[PDB]
Amino acid sequence: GYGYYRTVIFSAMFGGYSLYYFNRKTFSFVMPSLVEEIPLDKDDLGFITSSQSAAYAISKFVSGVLSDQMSARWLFSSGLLLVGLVNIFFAWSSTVPVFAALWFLNGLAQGLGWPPCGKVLRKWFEPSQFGTWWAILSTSMNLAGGLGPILATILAQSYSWRSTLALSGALCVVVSFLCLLLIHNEPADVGLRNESTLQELLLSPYLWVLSTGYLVVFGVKTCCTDWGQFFLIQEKGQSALVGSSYMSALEVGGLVGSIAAGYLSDRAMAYGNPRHGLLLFMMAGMTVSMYLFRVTVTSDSPKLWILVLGAVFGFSSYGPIALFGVIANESAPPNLCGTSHAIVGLMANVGGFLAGLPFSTIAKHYSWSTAFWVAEVICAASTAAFFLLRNIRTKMGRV
């Protein structure tokens, strides 16, 4: 029965997480213009991305493991300020080692944003709305990623990427203070108030199936998101604007996938779970759309086909992520939640890392088309393996 605190703190969290994701992907968008200005090869960008992904994986694992020695409001503000500062210092730089270092510091700082977001969510809300509130808050990433790719490309006509990065850093710095002044860790303003072992958890042959299902989906999604603009600009003849709009159309369907995965899971169709069929259909759609994008798209093709393929791929790729997040927590052994998700998140992050330097060097050796061929083959093999392996124990922890 509290008022206006829920609104203020929720808006603050939305803004903060939007800025985090916008900074990471603002490097992602300025990559082509940086390549045009600074003559970077095909394997330095992958090196930078891989370094950032590894740093983010380590930071996220550490922050998930240690989530008690914090105030949940100083950590958030410090992370936002550090991200803004590293972006500002990234704006004024030329060489490759500096880029890699200043982006391994950004990836390290990026791990302190999400873990403290739940420490206020669990305390400011009744436990009957946390499930939907998590899903509502998770769309900030899609909102931030569906606006940047087109905005930066359409603004770079008269202003260089340096101005964009500097302004993004300044905005992050200011919103750091604006969010430190508003977020409340726990309700204390006027006065408000409310067997199992690791051996038996790692040995269950379902955690690794879920984990590899996630190292494959996340790696494929990250590789496609990061290199679709380059695949469109080079090889097949399309302008830079069409390539940028592919990413924005990818996140437009991603928002629908995350917010409708839960709706389609429990309803309609209802060991195993009554979501494997939907998950397999989503994976098959992700493979078919990626194959069609690789083959059908040519120099002469209406942009509507490209946008439709991007939206379909986004919908087919952002659904399994939410499905995995739900299923891992639901099938986790009792009193082992959180630590049953840290491993899954760590392997998803390492799969995202695998789509950096190795993908870049595969493309550099032969072509982009071969790299996407390998990605499609991997996805198809994983889908077939999932389809063959359904009746396995999903009650890990004790039997």
Ligand X SMILES: O=P(O)(O)OC[C@H]1O[C@@H](O)[C@H](O)[C@@H](O)[C@@H]1O
- Residue number, 138 or 394, with CB nearest to ligand X: 138
Q: In the bound complex, what is the minimum distance in angstroms from residue 344's beta carbon to ligand X?
A: 8
SS (H, E, C) the chain: CCCCHHHHHHHHHHHHHHHHHHHHHHHHHHHHHHHHHCCCCCCHHHHHHHHHHHHHHHHHHHHHHCCCCCCCCHHHHHHHHHHHHHHHHHHCCCCHHHHHHHHHHHHHHHHHCCHHHHHHHHHHCCCCCHHHHHHHHCHHHHHHHCCHHHHHHHHCCCCCHHHHHHHHHHHHHHHHHHHHCCCCCCCCCCCCCCCCCCHHHHCCCCHHHHHHHHHHHHHHHHHHHHHHHHHHHCCCCCCHHHHHHHHHHHHHHHHHHHHHHHHHHHCCCCCCCCCHHHHHHHHHHHHHHHHHHHHCCCCCCCHHHHHHHHHHHHHHHHHHHHHHHHHHHHCCCCCCCCHHHHHHHHHHHHHHHHCCHHHHHHHHHCCHHHHHHHHHHHHHHHHHHHHHCCCCCCCCCCC
- Residue number, 121 or 306, with CB nearest to ligand X: 121
- Residue number, 210 or 321, with CB nearest to ligand X: 321
- In the region spanning residues 274 to 303, those forming contacts with ligand X, defined by CB under 6 A, are none
Q: Which residue has the tokens 């082992």?
A: 336
- In the region spanning residues 162 to 181, those forming contacts with ligand X, defined by CB under 6 A, are none
* Distance between CA atoms of residues 75 and 99, nearest Å: 25
Q: In the bound complex, what is the minimum distance in angstroms from residue 322's beta carbon to ligand X?
A: 6
Residue selected from 27, 103, 114, 353 as contacting ligand X according to rule CB under 6 A:
114
Site string for ligand X, 311-340 (x = CB under 6 A): ----------xx--x---------------
- Residue number, 310 or 351, with CB nearest to ligand X: 351
- Residue number, 232 or 321, with CB nearest to ligand X: 321
* Per rule CB under 6 A, count of chain residues that contact ligand X: 6
Q: In the bound complex, what is the minimum distance in angstroms from residue 259's beta carbon to ligand X?
A: 12
Q: Does 138 bind ligand X (CB under 6 A)?
A: yes
Q: In the bound complex, what is the minimum distance in angstroms from residue 201's beta carbon to ligand X?
A: 19
Q: Does 109 bind ligand X (CB under 6 A)?
A: no
CA 346 to chain centre: 13
Q: In the bound complex, what is the minimum distance in angstroms from residue 320's beta carbon to ligand X?
A: 10
- Residue number, 148 or 325, with CB nearest to ligand X: 325
- Residue number, 10 or 114, with CB nearest to ligand X: 114
- Residue number, 60 or 73, with CB nearest to ligand X: 60
Q: In the bound complex, what is the minimum distance in angstroms from residue 335's beta carbon to ligand X?
A: 20
- In the region spanning residues 37 to 96, those forming contacts with ligand X, defined by CB under 6 A, are 60
Residue closest to ligand X (Cβ): 325
Which pair of structure tokens corresponds to residue 135? 């899903």
- Residue number, 35 or 147, with CB nearest to ligand X: 147
- In the region spanning residues 366 to 395, those forming contacts with ligand X, defined by CB under 6 A, are none
Q: In the bound complex, what is the minimum distance in angstroms from residue 321's beta carbon to ligand X?
A: 5
Q: In the bound complex, what is the minimum distance in angstroms from residue 366's beta carbon to ligand X?
A: 30
CA–CA distance from 155 to each of 29, 33, 150, 159, 220 (Å)? 12, 12, 8, 7, 29
Q: Does 20 bind ligand X (CB under 6 A)?
A: no
Q: In the bound complex, what is the minimum distance in angstroms from residue 191's beta carbon to ligand X?
A: 32
* Distance between CA atoms of residues 58 and 69, nearest Å: 18
- Residue number, 20 or 293, with CB nearest to ligand X: 20
Q: In the bound complex, what is the minimum distance in angstroms from residue 240's beta carbon to ligand X?
A: 27
Residues that bind ligand X (CB under 6 A): 60, 114, 138, 321-322, 325
